[PDB]
Amino acid sequence: QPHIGNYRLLKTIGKGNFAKVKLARHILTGKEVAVKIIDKTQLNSSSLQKLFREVRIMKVLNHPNIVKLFEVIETEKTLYLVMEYASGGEVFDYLVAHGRMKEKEARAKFRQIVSAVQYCHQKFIVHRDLKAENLLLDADMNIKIADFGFSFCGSPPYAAPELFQGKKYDGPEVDVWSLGVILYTLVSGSLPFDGQNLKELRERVLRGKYRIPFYMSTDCENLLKKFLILNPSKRGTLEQIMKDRWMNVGHEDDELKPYVEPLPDYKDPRRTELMVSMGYTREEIQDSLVGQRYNEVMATYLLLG
Numbered sequence: 001q002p003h004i005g006n007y008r009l010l011k012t013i014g015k016g017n018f019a020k021v022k023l024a025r026h027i028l029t030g031k032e033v034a035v036k037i038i039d040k041t042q043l044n045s046s047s048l049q050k051l052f053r054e055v056r057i058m059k060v061l062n063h064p065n066i067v068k069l070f071e072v073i074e075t076e077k078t079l080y081l082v083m084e085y086a087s088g089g090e091v092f093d094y095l096v097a098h099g100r101m102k103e104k105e106a107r108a109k110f111r112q113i114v115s116a117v118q119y120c121h122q123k124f125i126v127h128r129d130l131k132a133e134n135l136l137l138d139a140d141m142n143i144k145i146a147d148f149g150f151s152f153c154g155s156p157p158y159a160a161p162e163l164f165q166g167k168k169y170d171g172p173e174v175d176v177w178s179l180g181v182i183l184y185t186l187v188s189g190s191l192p193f194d195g196q197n198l199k200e201l202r203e204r205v206l207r208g209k210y211r212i213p214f215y216m217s218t219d220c221e222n223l224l225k226k227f228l229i230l231n232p233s234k235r236g237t238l239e240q241i242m243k244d245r246w247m248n249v250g251h252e253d254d255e256l257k258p259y260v261e262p263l264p265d266y267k268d269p270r271r272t273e274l275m276v277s278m279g280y281t282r283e284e285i286q287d288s289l290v291g292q293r294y295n296e297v298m299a300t301y302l303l304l305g
């Protein structure tokens with residue numbers, strides 16, 4: 001029945017140059033899941049570093065709006081990251097279909113995005129490469145941030161000004177800039193900076209002047225100004241941005257705060273027993289959850305949600 005572990009591969013839903021993503025079915029539960037398959041035999045050093053960083057990141061993130069990791073399968077030649085499947089697909093697709101989002105809907109999505117990126121930042125993680133393909137949707141139209149493994153058509157229009165001026169290109173401030181671009185695209189359905197070429201693009205970014213769409217609220221535009229600051233050391237933190245008026249319109253008793261991760265349940269008597277009857281030991285279930293092993297036992301545990 002299965003192609004790898006407990007998974008019947010179904011359909012390629014994404015191709016990168018060094019990685020394929022497949023839609024697949026867990027067999028014991030029959031849930032749909034995303035499998036990232038990386039051929040390590042093709043990868044050079046920087047690629048390999050990038051990959052092991054990805055695995056590190058994925059094992060740690062536990063957010064409603066970032067794709068969740070279920071299992072890692074390692075062989076010498078090939079690595080598999082089994083993660084959550086977002087059936088809504090790319091937010092890019094959605095924009096092309098229905099045009100720009102009304103500020104109400106953009107806000108709902110953007111509160112999610114900001115929550116997720118600031119969560120990462122809390123854990124001293126910066127994505128450094130937020131572009132359109134990183135924003136996916138679940139079936140209820142929730143945001144799902146995807147891919148921390150960098151896998152040049154998408155990149156440039158989301159690049160912070162530092163890139164083009166030789167300055168260091170690390171730090172949460174990079175992501176803050178990208179969030180501005182993303183915001184602009186949600187409400188306008190287009191990019192703040194584009195060019196017919198790389199120099200055009202670079203001049204427009206270094207200038208940092210986007211053009212204001214006539215239909216756009218002044219509240220939105222004050223939000224934009226908080227993200228798209230040229231000087232990296234003068235850009236706000238997402239924690240500060242969270243307090244923003246536009247961020248909170250319609251949540252007047254529900255301001256946006258940093259995500260508080262809920263305490264772990266590695267001892268669900270319900271699921272545990274169902275796995276003892278399914279052929280696992282209790283010491284092995286607990287040891288896998290607490291050792292946070294992301295093994296076959298852990299995958300089954302989480303997938304019974």
Ligand SMILES: Cn1cc(-c2cnc3c(-c4csc(C(=O)N[C@H]5CCCC[C@H]5N)c4)cnn3c2)cn1
Pocket residue numbers: 013014015016019020021034036067083084085086087088089090133136146147148149151
């Ligand atoms: C209807 N519909 C649903 C989907 C769709 C596409 N991709 C995904 C993923 C995903 C997890 S890691 C990853 C990735 O790293 N991709 C990389 C490899 C593939 C190329 C892009 C890269 N960012 C993608 C999860 N759910 N999901 C759903 C698409 N259409």
